[PDB]
């Protein structure tokens, strides 16, 4: 419409259905002006070390990364949403972007000026066709702060390509943005458009009751006999033994289900007490890994392993859980404190899934016999075996909400290690740019480059609407529950607020399970 | 030509939490070569009263 | 079995339907499974780095960031499929010794 | 090279038409090296760490991977068998199960 | 929306002969526990409920 | 129903026994029904 | 069953942690039919085998 | 219309057809007096 | 790779987002804004 009519209004509740809930956020961002208005090729850092190593591109492009759980939920909905449901998967989304103002900067003697520039333009496009990297899977910085006070800048894109270290091989490809069509907008003008989730599981909220060895009925015994010993009957004679299992040996005995795959990590000890028995090391040594191409790569989230033994908190598998910071604002990329960050806790699936630090099992080795002894050996990782059972690492109200499924000819139960909902065709990227400005040409006619443009920034607002389905509990438990409280007790700042310098910050981690089922 | 063992040292396994428990079926497998029926798989076999 | 018997005279045909099977991928990638990450901006999660000697007998733990210059030290969504490894020969005139 | 050469065995690579599985390198671990390595122990100060590679990997969740590709020589499919059970039942020489 | 103790291979099944008589076995199930002692997600199922 | 738009989270009533031999709110080895912490409604909050 | 009472039945008490458990017992009991010679007699199974 | 609205779009791709292509490609432009 | 002949069919030409800066120099430093009312003229000569 015009410079003096307002594109959108500010909506940022969260209304609650019968089985759903609508997250409806919004923010304020701001977009640079990336490159001065050039695709430049980007390199790893040139060394020895092959791991680092990559090709791409940078553009003068920015995208709108929301993806993480505390960006469309508060902390109270969050725990309003855990402790009532079993499950919780996205079905609809909404993304709508209005009241763009460009503002134009000119320094002079050392003072900056800010004006607003009424005929510029900003352009904004959505990849429906997923024809572009897809760098959202990925978790990274530049997501929506979680607080809705804060202003979001828009982070920069860039991606990586087919490469031999840092040079490239003749299959990496150049994507060229602004070979897309886009839609310009000024500060009259606002974007939408609207997206719906392709059918995902649910995620599990609920824990079990049960172990996954404890199915069975404690009063009754098995009528399975099983081979039990070999004796020694006489001098050179032998006799075979079979018993069945019963109510007091439970440890031999038949079941129809196994742990899930596993993938063995390394211990640590967490606590104050233990902190001495660790030995001296790093996790690029002694750590668990996968290689690909004549790249290794530290194995980091893994496949789901409950992260310690029953009543020993304090050593934990090193490898798999996840940590987050406090605060989105830190800067700092190493601590060496634990009250700095927060470190989530995988327990809640050790009845179906084996503790990280153990092994999965053991096989016999060989062909026993009275001239050789049988042998067997540990498994520390175990590929899928007909029969298993797993559970998913939760989400978390600070993690990552999806990821896309690659398209590949083959996929093995697509969970994103990390977390969330792995998706075929997962929410679109957005693209937006401050389209250039130049200054002002020769006056006579040259054929050099322009480099020269007009210093300027936009900012407005963003609004994104989800819907999100939920799974009602239905449980016959007689007594409570754990829930999700929040006992800090007294203290100078509540916690999930703002302190008396006005950041924001989150205490500790949320997941979403607590409500248990039988398993 | 049997050795002397058991089947909770010698047999193969799977453990969970901090227990071990013996994989007592397993995932199926063939009990014994062909022509040799004599020499069989302990764990595999399910056995009836 | 039933058979058509055919003299010089004669001709034989029947027609047959594929059931539905998967295109095979006439493409190669673009990506690396390992490069999908965007190379500009830093991981926002920490994860266990080290153990050192804090004095004598002591110990501290380290966490860190993976950053946009460590990408082999990263949180990543997907791993690589399943492997049965082969050993190796060398193809060309030099390496043929 | 021709469908009709009589020799089952040769010594020279010029005779024959040997393929190059290069394209699925990006998904696809090289058939050299590891798939990656396990902790085979739990560490404290009495032990040290020990680790071990892993030569042969099942499925694990979150795995991708490519099939092999076909080729103008090769065959276009292959029988599942019937059997009880099934895993991913692309021909390994390649085609169409 | 109660522990299942029938997929385990148990005793108190129905004789295989119709003369015999069967007797009904108890009903009771196990929780997630630590050891003997019980866990705070452990669960209490009354079935007069 | 609450309608609260509170942005913290809110003190809620669960069990935290962590281990025990019996769990609470249920029968013991001797068959005996107990109930070890009384429970009152109010949690969830509201502006005055 | 249990002169009409909810027990609280438990593992042994001892070093070995493989065979604990935690758990309840119900005046309850149960109709397990899982098998199949309970349906089947041997000549209806060589029958149908 | 008037200062705060745009007046097109930015169309640089090319589709392709039967018996045909089309490319549509957009510049920024800038004249000197 | 695909294609044995092409030709041009029909074009379509348009023009839009127009903005004109004003340029003033004092003291060797420039200073750009944009003049709202002025105007820049455009045409196709059809007949050659
Ligand atoms: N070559 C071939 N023939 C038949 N079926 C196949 C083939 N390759 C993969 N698949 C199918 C079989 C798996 O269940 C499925 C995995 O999901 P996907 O969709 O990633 O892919
Ligand atoms: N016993 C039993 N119960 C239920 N489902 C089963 C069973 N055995 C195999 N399957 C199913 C489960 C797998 O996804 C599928 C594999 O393809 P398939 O068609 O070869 O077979």
Redesign the interface.
């Given at each position: 419409?015009?410079?003096g009519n307002s594109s959108g209004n500010w909506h940022c509740?969260s209304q609650w259905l019968e089985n759903g809930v609508v997250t409806r956020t919004t923010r304020t961002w701001v977009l640079p002006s990336y490159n001065n208005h050039l695709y430049k090729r980007?390199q790893?850092?040139s060394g020895g070390?092959n791991?680092?190593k990559?090709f791409?591109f940078?553009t003068p492009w920015g995208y709108f990364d929301y993806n993480r759980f505390h960006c469309h939920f508060?902390?109270?909905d969050?725990?309003r949403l855990i402790?009532n449901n079993w499950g919780i998967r996205p079905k609809a989304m909404r993304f709508r972007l209005f009241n763009i103002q460009v503002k134009e900067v000119?320094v002079?003697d050392s003072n900056t000026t800010i004006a607003n520039?009424?005929?510029?333009?900003v352009?904004v496009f959505a990849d429906k066709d997923y024809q572009l990297?897809?760098?959202l899977?990925?978790?990274?910085?530049?997501?929506f702060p979680p607080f809705p006070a804060d202003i979001y800048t828009i982070?920069?894109?860039?991606?990586?390509?087919?490469?031999y270290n840092n040079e490239a091989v003749d299959?990496?490809?150049f994507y060229c943005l602004?070979?897309?069509?886009?839609?310009?907008?000024?500060?009259?003008?606002n974007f939408e458009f609207t997206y719906t989730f392709e059918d995902v599981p649910f995620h599990s909220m609920f824990?079990?009751?049960?172990?996954?060895?404890?199915?069975?009925?404690?009063?009754?015994?098995?009528?399975?006999?099983?081979?039990?010993?070999?004796?020694?009957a006489g001098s050179s004679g032998?006799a075979?033994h079979?018993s069945?299992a019963t109510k007091?040996?439970?440890?031999?005995?038949?079941?129809?289900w196994?742990?899930?795959?596993f993938?063995?990590?390394?211990?640590?000890?967490?606590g104050a007490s233990n902190?001495?028995?660790?030995?001296?090391?790093?996790?690029?040594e002694?750590?668990?890994?996968?290689?690909?191409?004549n790249?290794?790569?530290?194995?980091?989230?893994g496949?789901?392993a409950?992260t310690t033994?029953?009543?020993e908190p304090d050593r934990q598998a090193?490898?798999n859980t996840?940590?987050?910071?406090r605060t989105?604002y830190d800067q700092t990329?190493?601590?060496?404190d634990?009250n700095q960050?927060l470190?989530t806790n995988e327990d809640?699936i050790?009845?179906t899934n084996?503790?990280g630090?153990?092994?999965?099992?053991?096989?016999?080795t060989n062909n026993?016999?009275?001239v050789?002894?049988?042998?067997?050996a540990?498994?520390?990782?175990?590929?899928?075996?007909?029969?298993m059972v797993?559970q998913?690492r939760d989400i978390y109200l600070q993690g990552p909400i999806w990821?896309k499924?690659?398209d590949?000819?083959?996929?093995?139960?697509?969970?994103?290690?990390?977390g969330g909902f792995?998706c075929k065709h997962p929410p679109p990227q957005i693209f937006i740019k401050n389209?250039?400005?130049?200054?002002?040409?020769?006056?006579?006619?040259q054929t050099a480059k322009?480099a020269s443009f007009?210093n300027q920034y936009s900012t407005g607002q963003c609004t994104v609407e989800i819907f999100w389905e939920l799974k009602k509990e239905?449980?016959?438990?007689?007594?409570?529950?754990?829930?999700?409280?929040?006992?800090f007790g007294n203290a100078a700042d509540?916690?999930?607020?703002v302190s008396d310098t006005g950041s924001y910050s989150e205490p500790r981690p949320i997941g979403t399970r607590y409500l248990?089922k039988?398993?």
């Amino acid at each position: 419409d015009g410079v003096g009519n307002s594109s959108g209004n500010w909506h940022c509740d969260s209304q609650w259905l019968e089985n759903g809930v609508v997250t409806r956020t919004t923010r304020t961002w701001v977009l640079p002006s990336y490159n001065n208005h050039l695709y430049k090729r980007i390199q790893g850092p040139s060394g020895g070390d092959n791991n680092n190593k990559f090709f791409g591109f940078s553009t003068p492009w920015g995208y709108f990364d929301y993806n993480r759980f505390h960006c469309h939920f508060s902390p109270r909905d969050w725990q309003r949403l855990i402790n009532n449901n079993w499950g919780i998967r996205p079905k609809a989304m909404r993304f709508r972007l209005f009241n763009i103002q460009v503002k134009e900067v000119t320094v002079q003697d050392s003072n900056t000026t800010i004006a607003n520039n009424l005929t510029s333009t900003v352009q904004v496009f959505a990849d429906k066709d997923y024809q572009l990297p897809y760098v959202l899977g990925s978790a990274t910085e530049g997501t929506f702060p979680p607080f809705p006070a804060d202003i979001y800048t828009i982070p920069q894109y860039g991606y990586c390509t087919l490469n031999y270290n840092n040079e490239a091989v003749d299959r990496s490809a150049f994507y060229c943005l602004d070979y897309f069509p886009s839609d310009m907008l000024r500060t009259g003008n606002n974007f939408e458009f609207t997206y719906t989730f392709e059918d995902v599981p649910f995620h599990s909220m609920f824990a079990h009751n049960q172990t996954l060895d404890r199915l069975m009925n404690p009063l009754v015994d098995q009528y399975l006999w099983a081979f039990s010993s070999v004796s020694q009957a006489g001098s050179s004679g032998r006799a075979l033994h079979y018993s069945r299992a019963t109510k007091t040996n439970m440890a031999a005995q038949y079941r129809n289900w196994l742990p899930g795959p596993f993938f063995r990590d390394q211990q640590i000890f967490t606590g104050a007490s233990n902190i001495t028995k660790n030995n001296v090391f790093s996790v690029w040594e002694k750590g668990k890994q996968w290689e690909l191409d004549n790249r290794t790569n530290l194995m980091q989230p893994g496949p789901a392993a409950a992260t310690t033994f029953s009543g020993e908190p304090d050593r934990q598998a090193m490898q798999n859980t996840l940590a987050f910071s406090r605060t989105v604002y830190d800067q700092t990329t190493a601590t060496t404190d634990r009250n700095q960050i927060l470190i989530t806790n995988e327990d809640e699936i050790r009845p179906t899934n084996s503790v990280g630090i153990d092994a999965w099992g053991a096989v016999p080795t060989n062909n026993q016999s009275i001239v050789t002894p049988g042998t067997r050996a540990a498994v520390n990782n175990q590929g899928a075996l007909p029969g298993m059972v797993w559970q998913n690492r939760d989400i978390y109200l600070q993690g990552p909400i999806w990821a896309k499924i690659p398209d590949t000819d083959n996929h093995f139960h697509p969970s994103p290690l990390i977390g969330g909902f792995g998706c075929k065709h997962p929410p679109p990227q957005i693209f937006i740019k401050n389209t250039p400005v130049p200054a002002n040409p020769s006056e006579t006619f040259q054929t050099a480059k322009v480099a020269s443009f007009i210093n300027q920034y936009s900012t407005g607002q963003c609004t994104v609407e989800i819907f999100w389905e939920l799974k009602k509990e239905t449980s016959k438990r007689w007594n409570p529950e754990i829930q999700f409280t929040s006992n800090f007790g007294n203290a100078a700042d509540i916690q999930f607020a703002v302190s008396d310098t006005g950041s924001y910050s989150e205490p500790r981690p949320i997941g979403t399970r607590y409500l248990t089922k039988p398993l």
